[model samples]
Target: MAKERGLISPSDFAQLQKYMEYSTKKVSDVLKLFEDGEMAKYVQGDAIGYEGFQQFLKIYLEVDNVPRHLSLALFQSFETGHCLNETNVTKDVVCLNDVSCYFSLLEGGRPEDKLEWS
Candidate 1:
């Protein structure tokens, strides 16, 4: 049934939603921190900067400590998934859609029911 729709089963989706109620706060919290901090400069028009992203991982998330140089690796990997380009006013950056799709995935199917394919 799930395979027919390319979606997880309802049982799993129920479990996921239950888990979401608990997990959503943490996810929103971290993402909020990024948008509210110096890393806000990471954004340019519709683009987002890798350097500022690196700083956020280095300071706010502290991914820098757990795995040395993993910070750069993470951004590069994300950029690889994105276009990694620039505007006349900014350095290389990823598309806003790249970042938003990620946020969407982590928060996937959290607050609703019955799939709406948009």
Candidate 2:
């Protein structure tokens, strides 16, 4: 629907798919760490929302020396499904705040810099 709406072009779709694959892998790795009880507690408690998750991911990516864009991609992928209902109806509008925030973070500073939303 994004393509039909011109929200994304064909090239954009391809690039987005690349980001999706990378983001999925990175998110899976972080999730694996959460399989540890202590890590799970931290994520469940302190890393409760989108910004929190973004910060948490920054730490993980920094330590691993990976691209921070993966976190941004992960955030976007989550927001893409923000309004799906089990009854096959739309519940609300899909929010783009997280995705917007991610791009803002990317343009705001260097890779090591953390998300600073206002």
Candidate 3:
């Protein structure tokens, strides 16, 4: 049985580094900003390449979809996150299908996220 991938693990947010550019906290809020910016085609859980990551970041940065080395550099950094899981893998013959995959926003789980659990 093929289980659905976890999809965009919380740690992957940090993998974004400065890529999202001035975004911190609330991947939900940040994604909407990108959607507003121009990610109309890529809904979460929709698969796209690191080139997609590159493109989105470039677009987010107002720039591919940036260059081969540049885009690939952004890929493969986090091999264990939900992104790279086998279930999220897509069928691509061009480039980097393994790393580029789905996304999901998360909030209010950790006890330390200003969530006071008494």
Candidate 4:
């Protein structure tokens, strides 16, 4: 489908397949960390505390470009997904690489977004 849409070339498709395998494993690692109840260890001290974490979480939720309202939406999404309370959906996206993309995606689109599954 991506080939038909020209969203990706064949070589790009091959690279994407490799990316999926890598991302899947990355998810596993994050999930393990979540299960261990150690999310703060992944973030920064300047970005801890409920208020700080809320602000930090807000950035991950800003998918559609809205500011404060969009940040709230991300907070709600994280809570709903149980990632806010260390349930499990943390694996769905939070890796060192994935977290970087959550921030850097607007400036430089991620490889997963280059495909379709992001």
Candidate 5:
């Protein structure tokens, strides 16, 4: 039933939503720390903060076996630094590497696979 519609079952979707909410809060908190330059006091470099993020992915998204699409959506929320009902108007200000990091996490280290060129 799930594969037929390219979606997870209702029960699994519920779990995915829960994890997404958790990820959203955690990402916002980390972004605040990053903005204040206080994250450096606790962790070195931008990648270090991903330790918690990756753990959540591994536990809920991986161990719990959520669909890959949901995992990618979760990653997108963090990459854009905005959750549902929010907008990112400063695309020019976004760091390319940071967005790629999230893509790599979702795409098995092959973020380029999703890119298109003319």
Candidate 6:
């Protein structure tokens, strides 16, 4: 879709080459939670609602327990890949959650009419 939308140009694609180079130690701290069986707790009953879901994830995960964990870990790990295991990185890469939901949305809509679905 990004390619079809032409949102990223050649230079941006080139930059990703450099980006991927630094991702050898890319720890999926966020995906680890759902993979570990915690996502279900955030989707039950009233917690299933959008705002409720956010609050549930925020609190249930004890995200506040390690507030600066994500950024610090990302920087300290992928930026240098040095002492990658030193910090107990928090689960905050919920970008995968959003990506999963987006693909689900697309899958539910007519493939030929994806634009209308958007």
Model 2 TM-score, all chains together: 0.29
Q: Which candidate is the best by TM-score?
A: 1
lDDT of 3 at 74: 43
Q: Which ten residues in a row have the lowest lDDT in candidate 2?
A: 1-10
Query: Model 2 over residues 1-118: C-alpha lDDT tens digits?
Result: 1212233334444544554435523443444455453445444432244544554445444343434455455544544333354554332222333343343333332233343335
After aligning candidate 3 to the native by TM-score, how far in Å is the CA of 66 from where it should be?
Answer: 1.2
TM-score of 3: 0.35
CA lDDT, every model vs. true structure? 0.48, 0.41, 0.40, 0.37, 0.43, 0.34
Tens digits of per-residue lDDT for model 1, 51-109: 65655444433433423344444454445322348435436666544544443454652
Best by lDDT: 1
Better of 3 and 6 by TM-score: 3
lDDT, candidate 2, at 90: 37
State residue 59's C-alpha deviation in candidate 1, in Å. Answer: 4.9
lDDT of 6: 0.34
Query: Once model 5 is optimally superposed onto the true structure by TM-score, how far is the C-alpha of residue 54 displaced, in angstroms?
Result: 5.6
4 or 6, which is superior by TM-score? 4
What would the TM-score be for candidate 1 when compared with the true structure? 0.41
**C-alpha TM-score for every candidate:** 0.41, 0.29, 0.35, 0.26, 0.26, 0.24
Q: How well is each residue in 3-110 modelled by candidate 3, as lDDT tens digits?
A: 435543344554454445454444444355444545535433433434345555555434434445544544543332344446755533222122222222222222
Indicate the residue-level lDDT of 49 in model 1. Answer: 73
Q: Which stretches of candidate 2 lie over 4 Å from their true place?
A: 1-26, 45-48, 63-74, 80-118
